[PDB]
């Protein structure tokens, strides 16, 4: 059980010998608005079958961004082919300033505001991967106090 968002039902095909098999696919994003976001994919024939597979894949690859008070650690980037999403912390709490396929992301991660356009492509299957990468580039202030080796008073 997670807080749910549905990206889109995809359009794919299987080309059988004597015709055209209707293949069906989908892509959702889940999570409980705290920093934890997953995403699912339905490779099936029908819509609730892709909900079944959407939670089969949405149940995993669901990790936590170090949410420093409904904000971002700092400005990060996500590159995975044409998903090129640079995310910017700015003034927060005054308008969920995001693209369509990432406004659900800081919904399900709980950021107050972001400043996130995208470059490359608006292809959603690279948007979600660049979004995972945009969370992945983040070191945090407890590590710059800790992993860097000195409790630096920029955060202290």
């Amino acid at each position: 059980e997670f807080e749910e968002r549905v990206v889109s039902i995809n359009r794919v095909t299987k080309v059988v010998k004597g015709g055209r098999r209707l293949r069906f696919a989908a892509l959702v994003v889940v999570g409980d608005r705290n920093g934890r976001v997953g995403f699912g994919t339905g490779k099936a024939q029908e819509v609730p079958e892709a909900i079944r597979k959407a939670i089969e894949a949405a149940k995993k690859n669901l990790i936590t961004v170090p949410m420093v008070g409904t904000t971002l650690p700092h400005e990060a980037l996500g590159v995975f082919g044409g998903g090129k999403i640079l995310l910017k912390p700015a003034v927060e709490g005054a308008g969920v300033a995001a693209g369509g396929a990432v406004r659900a992301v800081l919904e399900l991660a709980g950021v107050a505001d972001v400043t996130s356009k995208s470059l490359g492509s608006n292809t959603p299957i690279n948007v979600v991967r660049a979004t995972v990468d945009g969370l992945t580039q983040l070191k945090r202030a407890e590590e710059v106090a800790a992993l860097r080796g000195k409790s630096v008073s920029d955060f202290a």
């Binding site: 003034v91 927060e92 709490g93 005054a94 308008g95 300033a97």
Partner: protein
């Protein structure tokens, strides 16, 4: 101007405190699609839904709304939404409406707009007069004996926060200002500000 509320009353089921009345049965849009089924919305649909409930519930126009709403988008103090929804009470018909005297804000806008209530030496022809706190609202006795006012507005009732309620003279004084701590419909700067103010 002065349009009905099949949208507020029917496409939300809630005519909120620009009127306040929960409407009766048959909450669809009737005529056609009254006995018929529902619909759905999106993030556009609730940008849409929130701007029309907060805007069209009250009695505001969109010219005055978005112009004075960029003028509510002035400062950059972090969350500006306090400066947005704080300027929901600063219209005078809302002030009397939170004195509880008028049934709707449209009633105080009517019979305050007529030049009945003379708020400090001016024949009042704007009930969206921008209200400053700690000031009195002078009310004319002719207005106090208007039989529509004697029927509803002088027909007294309860009273909200943030003012002083002169039940004897039907007056008020803005003590503090209401806010997100005070008033709470589903007000979202993403929905209204990211529907209007350079959609973002």
């Amino acid at each position: 101007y002065t349009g009905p509320s099949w949208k507020q009353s029917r496409r939300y089921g809630i005519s909120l405190t620009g009127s306040g009345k929960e409407i009766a049965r048959r909450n669809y849009v009737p005529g056609q699609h009254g006995p018929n089924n529902r619909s759905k919305l999106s993030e556009y649909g609730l940008q849409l839904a929130e701007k029309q409930k907060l805007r069209f519930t009250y009695g505001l126009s969109e010219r005055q709304f978005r112009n004075l709403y960029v003028a509510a988008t002035k400062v950059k103090e972090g969350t500006v939404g306090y400066n947005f929804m704080t300027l929901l009470e600063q219209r005078l018909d809302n002030v009397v409406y939170r004195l509880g005297l008028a049934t709707t804000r449209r009633q105080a806008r009517q019979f305050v707009n007529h030049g009945h209530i003379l708020v400090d030496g001016k024949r009042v022809d704007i009930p969206s007069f921008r209200v400053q706190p700690g000031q009195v609202i002078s009310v004319r006795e002719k207005s106090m004996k208007v039989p529509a006012i004697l029927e509803a507005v002088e027909a007294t009732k309860g009273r909200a926060n943030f003012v002083s309620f002169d039940a004897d003279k039907l007056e008020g004084t803005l003590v503090r200002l209401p806010e997100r701590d005070e008033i709470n419909p589903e007000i979202n700067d993403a929905l209204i500000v990211e529907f209007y103010n350079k959609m973002m």
